[PDB]
């Protein structure tokens, strides 16, 4: 129905496929399985990417 997560710390993408998240933000959960341990997949302002060691907590 709806599964999102809140960003607890700032993260800046280093690659074009990477996502950038600030504190007090809203990350949409796409797939907790990215093939890399500690990395989840979410969608942000038109761009999709992963974050290091879970920078988002499923609020919904």
């Amino acid at each position: 129905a709806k599964e999102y997560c809140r960003t607890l710390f700032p993260y800046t993408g280093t690659n074009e496929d990477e996502l950038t998240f600030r504190e007090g933000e809203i990350i949409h959960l796409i797939s907790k399985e990215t093939g890399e341990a500690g990395w989840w997949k979410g969608e942000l302002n038109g761009k999709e990417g992963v974050f290091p060691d879970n920078f988002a907590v499923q609020i919904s």
């Binding site: 800046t12 990477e18 093939g35």
Partner: protein
């Protein structure tokens, strides 16, 4: 100057490399201990990826700093 090298697995490693040191050298050091090849090593600092041809002084990396090591990027 000591430095922390974190990993997605939660493994933090200590390394000794002054500011003048080059990023390429740093990767070589990590490879000496952890065995991981520099070709797969990804160093993240301040939200930017460290350039092999640059030095710790370029990114203003001081002692007791934390460097995120990304290994095998299956995601994106």
């Amino acid at each position: 100057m000591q430095i922390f090298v974190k990993t997605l697995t939660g493994k933090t490693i200590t390394l000794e490399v002054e500011p003048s040191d080059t990023i390429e050298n740093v990767k070589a050091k990590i490879q000496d201990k952890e065995g991981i090849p520099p070709d797969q090593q990804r160093l993240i600092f301040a939200g930017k990826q460290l350039e092999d041809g640059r030095t710790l002084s370029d990114y203003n990396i001081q002692k007791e700093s934390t460097l995120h090591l990304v290994l095998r990027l299956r995601g994106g």
